[PDB]
Ligand binder design. Structure first.
Ligand code: SAM
Length: 254
């Protein structure tokens, strides 16, 4: 069989799904920032995804075996079965159902930015923690991390990842509101999406001490202006922007 890989979620890709089935798709799986569509053979489709031959085997196992260490200096994200000879700070993460294996651009943007902005002793909020990777990273850098997620299903994944890495961040079900009793914070890192950053911008100011920093990603490049506006409106000072592929991270201070 063949896989046709599309960037996005099922929610975003909703209008074209019928066409994939019309083209002969027998299955679909939502993966980390991608949707995989499974066909007996390739067909010419207008949707600008990528065809990959995956057949004769277990597609999941082939994907799993092909995974390599993910560099995000000063870190390297490793599956439990990887080794790494470099001097990078290892973050051992099981590539599971929760977003945050280290293989997505946004996660990597967030990890690199954390290292540039975190001061040891800093109280850190990881909003939308998923696998726990950013909270784990924050602990490695000398931060005191709290990771929260609206999906309670990610929490035992995050706890298990923390244990594997010899760190003890706090993990809790909820959103920014559930975090607020534990703040204010020195540093907020939030790999979410543009519309949600914009909506939350006022509460972000709230969540941070004076001098605090907000590191926002999960932002598509053409949706960035939306975030720049909201953050400016809440009195944030822009610090730096970083990009990878179609994604950006926007760093702010107050
Ligand atoms: C793009 S993933 C990022 C995960 C991890 N922080 C990383 O950087 O790879 C976003 C996570 O935020 C969670 N999430 C979405 N909306 C949220 C909200 N309003 N409050 C808290 N978490 C949210 C999702 O369930 C998902 O686990």
């Amino acid at each position: 069989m063949w896989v046709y890989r599309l960037k996005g979620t099922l929610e975003a890709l909703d209008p074209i799904l019928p066409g994939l089935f019309d083209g002969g798709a027998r299955g679909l799986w939502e993966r980390e920032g991608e949707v995989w569509a499974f066909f007996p053979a390739p067909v010419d489709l207008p949707y600008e995804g990528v065809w990959e031959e995956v057949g004769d085997e277990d597609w999941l196992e082939a994907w799993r075996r092909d995974l390599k260490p993910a560099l995000a200096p000063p870190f390297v994200v490793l599956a439990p079965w990887h080794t790494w000879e470099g001097a990078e700070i290892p973050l051992v993460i099981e590539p599971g159902m929760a977003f945050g294996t280290g293989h997505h651009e946004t996660t990597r943007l967030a990890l690199k930015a954390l290292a540039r902005h975190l001061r040891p002793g800093d109280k850190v909020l990881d909003l939308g923690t998923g696998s726990g990777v950013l909270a784990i990273a924050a602990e490695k850098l000398g931060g005191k991390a709290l990771g929260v997620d609206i999906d309670p299903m990610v929490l035992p994944q995050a706890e298990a990842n923390a244990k594997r890495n010899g760190v003890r961040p706090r993990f809790l079900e909820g959103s920014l509101e559930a975090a607020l009793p534990f703040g204010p914070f020195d540093l907020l890192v939030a790999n979410l999406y543009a519309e949600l950053h914009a909506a939350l911008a006022p509460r972000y100011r709230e969540a941070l001490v004076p001098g605090g920093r907000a590191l926002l990603t999960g932002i598509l490049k053409d949706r960035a202006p939306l975030v720049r506006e909201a953050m400016a409106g809440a009195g944030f000072r822009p610090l730096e922007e970083a990009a990878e592929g179609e994604w950006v991270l926007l760093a702010y201070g107050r």
